[PDB]
Structure formats: structure tokens, C-alpha cells
Amino acid sequence: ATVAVDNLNPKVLKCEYAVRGEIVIHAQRLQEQLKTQPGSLPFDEILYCNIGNPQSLGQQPVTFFREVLALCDHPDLLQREEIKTLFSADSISRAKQILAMIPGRATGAYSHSQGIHGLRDAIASGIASRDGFPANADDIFLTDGASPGVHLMMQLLIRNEKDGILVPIPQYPLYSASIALHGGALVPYYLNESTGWGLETSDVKKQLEDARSRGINVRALVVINPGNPTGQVLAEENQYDIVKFCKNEGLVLLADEVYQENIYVDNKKFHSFKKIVRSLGYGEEDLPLVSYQSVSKGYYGECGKRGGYFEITGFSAPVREQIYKIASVNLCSNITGQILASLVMNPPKASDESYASYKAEKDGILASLARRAKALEHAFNKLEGITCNEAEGAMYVFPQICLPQKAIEAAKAANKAPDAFYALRLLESTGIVVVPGSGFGQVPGTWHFRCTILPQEDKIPAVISRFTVFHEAFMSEYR
């Protein structure tokens, strides 16, 4: 029989990934329409407001980072006196220190499947000057981004359709996609929109009991902190609760901390789950704890590079061997992403002026983002039926829309979720690509969308004008 949709793996069919799905494919059809037919569209550019891809938009690559990477890439450059004029001194000094920790100066070879050892040591030292607690090179696994590390873990832990993971609703849908792909149950817990997207451990507990009664064995809890799509930053005190909760529930803690250097609210600061766990005084029975961090986000932003890592603690060898086994299949992650992870974790120290150029780009880039983060909040809040929460961190705003019934029905007719119907019509009127609430998951009855915070600071008012024009015409058909 011919290979067809009817005879593919069910886990691939139930899998859905909205960030790069229906709306984006529609957007690319429209992209062609204005190479081919300039002027047939009511707008000029397509604005991808759908993906946290800072450099896609204006963001400038940090220079110290690119300098070292250009150097490690072509190491012969180091045997030439000119480079001294074009490259910073400590970038040349860092390149050389790095090449000296790869075994035969081979930047092109496969590394140990956990990552070059040096780079792992560097990262372990960055973790420890962030926590106040030591870290081990042996516990780190360098990955092609944070993504493969979530797959690795779903695959380790899900034996059955009956296996379950607690996931926030709404969630960055790599979790809901990864979990369908590995054929396991998704067990929602519900972030309180009214309480600033608050995570309450009694809600988790209740949801964990409902899933157990239903017969599902729940293996782990994912926490996204800072959150995506909701940008909440969890607080120290709430974090002790989650850790104590996993301990007596026999649950792996999956800590997604990719947005850690994206904290915009003056009031709160980032705290590692490792910092919390160590401090509570756990050394093993550590609950298993896996922490993810990536090079894609923050100020570096750096997604194409495909670099990141995760740290494990509180697993036995021979469970650790089994992890090593899954990772060793692809051999290793890409070296340039590995070097990059090390750099993000040891940036310049003030010891050198390149440090001064660095501090300027890092700041400014982060001021830009939160200046940007607030403007979109205020803009959206002024709109009929739209309410936009504070964004403590990350790079996303996630407004609620109070879609009228005439609009819910027109969506039922079009065979679309009300969210997606809105997101699609927006796109047709304005070229603005956003991701609909659905398959981020949301409280049934409520409706949202996720915009990026990353359009160019100067392009923003023009963007919220195109938008409001559409929204208010949409409201006038459908209220």
C-alpha cells in the first residue's frame, strides 16, 4: 500500500506544533503573493510576530561572541600579526584558550557525546557563580539547543500511553508536541490569569490526583520559568513549594529556564531550581532534577547556532548510563553551539575593555526589550475586549480577547478554533503573524494569542496601528 497519511505513525498525526503551523504556512503563501503581485495586498511586509527569533528582527549579534567564533573557525588567522588590529585582544586570548582544550585542536571532530570536557567545566563554574553552590562537569550535557534535551527526557521516562507529565496550561508547545511524539499522556495544570499567571501547588495537587484516578502514572512536572507564553517569573517562596511538592510526590522536576536572563520587573529576580534544591539541602533524592538553559534567548540571541545544555542531579548510575546511551546516538552536539554555551556562561569579567563594549550591548538590548515589553502591553490593553497581563520576563505578550458569539460561530462554520480564526483574519488584513491561544492550551472558554516583543522599537507604533484598524473592524462585524 502507498505511504499515505492514513498509514503513518499515529504519534506523528496527533502531534501538533502551532508556532510553525497553520498560520505560518498561510503566511508563506502570502509572502509569495507580494513577490509575485506587488500591491494586491493591503500591506507591504509580512511581520513574523510568531517566533522568539530576536535577530530575525533588529537585534545585533554581540561582537565578542562572534569574534571568538570566527577565530575558532579559522584558527590559522592566529598566526598573523594583522588580526591584532581587527580583533579584540581578549577575544584572541579566549579563542586560544578554547582551542587548547579541544584534544588535537580539532574544532571539526566529534566531541565526547556530553560535550567537550573543558566547555563543560566552564559551564559548571558559571552555574556555581550564580547559585553559591558547586556544579559538576559530569552532570552537564551539551545539546543542539535546549530542544533535544526535552525529547531525550520524554523518551527516557514515557513507557506508555498511560505515562504522564504535568504541564502548565498555557505552555510553549514543544512539550505538548514532544509528549504526543513519544506517545505519553499530557496532564494539565492551570496558571491563574487573574493572579498574574500564578502557579498554585494545590491546583497541581488536585490535577495530579485527577490524573491518577483516571489511571495515569505521572512521572514528572515541567516548570517553565520565566514562563512562555506567559512571562511570569516564579518567586523564591513559591519555588520551595514546588520542590517540596515533587519530593513527596516522587516526581522528576523538569526545569525549563531558557528565559533566565530576560527579567524586566524591577521587583523580582531569577532563581535556579538548582539554587533552590541545594539550599533546601538535598544531595540525592534530589528528586530527579533536570535544568535546561539555551543560547537562543536573553541578550545573545543566537537561535541559529543551536547551542545549550541541561544539568542532571538525583539520578543513579545506571540511569545515568542510559541517558548517556540516548545522547551518544547522534554523537554530539555542534561544536560552535558548545563554545557559545561556554561563553554565555562565562562572559567578559570587567577584566577587559572588550567587557566594556559587551556591557553596553547587553544593557540597552535588555532595556530595549522591556521598554518594548511595556509598550505592547499598553497598546493591547486599550483595545475593545482585549486585556493584556504584565510581562515579567521572556519575550512575549499573551493577550486575552473576549471574542463575541457571532465570531465564535463564523469560526465553527469555517471549521476553525475561534483563536485561529482571529489569527488568520488578522494576517489577511495586516501581514502580522501571531500564534493563536489554541495548542498553547488555555482554560476552556478563554481566548488568546502570542505576540513577540521583538519588532524594532521604531516599527512598533506603525504595527499597532495596522492592528487596531483590523481589530476594530473585526469587532464591528462581530459584536
Would you call 35 helix, strand, or coil by DSSP?
helix
Q: How many whole angstroms separate alpha carbon 337 and alpha carbon 360?
A: 23
Segment 69-108, which members bind ligand DCS (CB under 6 A)?
none
Which cell is 271 given?
532563581
Choice between 132 and 318, CB closer to a second copy? 318
Q: How many whole angstroms separate alpha carbon 140 and alpha carbon 153?
A: 14
**For residue 103, cis peptide bond before it (omega within 30 degrees of 0):** no
Q: How many whole angstroms separate alpha carbon 6 and alpha carbon 17?
A: 20
Name the minimum Å distance from CB 468 to ligand DCS.
24
Asked if residue 136 binds a second copy (CB under 8 A), the reply is: no
Q: How many whole angstroms separate alpha carbon 448 and alpha carbon 434?
A: 10
Among 140, 156, 277, 397, binds a second copy (CB under 8 A): 156
User: At residue 189, what are phi and psi to the nearest 5 degrees?
Assistant: -120, 150
Choice between 82 and 237, CB closer to a second copy? 82
Best CA proximity match to 255, nearest among 328, 406, 150: 150
Q: Could you tell me which residues come within 8 angstroms of residue 370 by beta carbon, excluding any fewer than 6 positions away?
A: 264
Residue type, 198: G
**Residues facing 451 on adjacent strands:** 397
Q: Which residue is closest to ligand DCS by CB?
A: 145
313 within 8 A of 127, measured Cβ to Cβ: no
Which cell is 97 given?
584558550
Asked if residue 111 binds a second copy (CB under 8 A), the reply is: yes
Name the minimum Å distance from CB 295 to ligand DCS.
6
Lay out the site mask for a second copy across 77-106 (x = CB under 8 A, - = otherwise).
x--x-xx-xx----------------xx-x
Asked if residue 73 binds a second copy (CB under 8 A), the reply is: yes
Q: Could you tell me which residues come within 8 angstroms of residue 422 by beta carbon, excluding any fewer than 6 positions away?
A: 401, 403, 407, 411, 436, 447, 449, 474
Q: How many whole angstroms separate alpha carbon 270 and alpha carbon 284?
A: 23
Asked if residue 54 binds a second copy (CB under 8 A), the reply is: yes
Name the minimum Å distance from CB 55 to a second copy.
4
Lay out the site mask for a second copy across 440-459 (x = CB under 8 A, - = otherwise).
--------------------
Lay out the site mask for ligand DCS across 172-191 (x = CB under 6 A, - = otherwise).
x-x-----------------
Segment 283-322, which members bind a second copy (CB under 8 A)?
285, 288, 296, 300-306, 315-316, 318-319, 322
Which of ligand DCS, a second copy, none lies near 54, with the C-beta cut-off 5 to 8 A by kind? a second copy
Asked if residue 303 binds ligand DCS (CB under 6 A), the reply is: yes
Asked if residue 258 binds ligand DCS (CB under 6 A), the reply is: yes
Best CA proximity match to 162, nearest among 215, 89, 120, 202: 215
Which of ligand DCS, a second copy, none lies near 177, with the C-beta cut-off 5 to 8 A by kind? a second copy
- Integer angstrom CA distances of residue 8 from 14, 240, 318: 11, 44, 34
Part of the chain binding ligand DCS (CB under 6 A), chosen from 124-132, 141-149, 161-169, 245-253: 141-149
Lay out the site mask for a second copy across 186-215 (x = CB under 8 A, - = otherwise).
------------------------------
Part of the chain binding ligand DCS (CB under 6 A), chosen from 99-107, 143-151, 363-371, 376-384: 143-151
Asked if residue 116 binds ligand DCS (CB under 6 A), the reply is: no
Give me the residues that bind ligand DCS (CB under 6 A), please: 19, 51-52, 145-147, 172, 174, 224, 228, 256, 258, 294, 296, 303, 308, 331
